[PDB]
Amino acid sequence: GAQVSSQKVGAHENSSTINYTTINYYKDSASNAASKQDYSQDPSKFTEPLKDVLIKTAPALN
């Protein structure tokens, strides 16, 4: 059940891809650590909730 993922390596030693290993020890998912590999989304539903969405170089009002 060992899960192996890659580290986003910031400062590199003078020595490529480095990994880390994870194993869940408990049956309940609430017991689990945070994976922190998170997906991002569009701001659109807040920044542009328009019914007719318009392209920025055209007149906003027409």
Partner: peptide
Amino acid sequence: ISEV
């Protein structure tokens, strides 16, 4: 194992 499960390597992503």
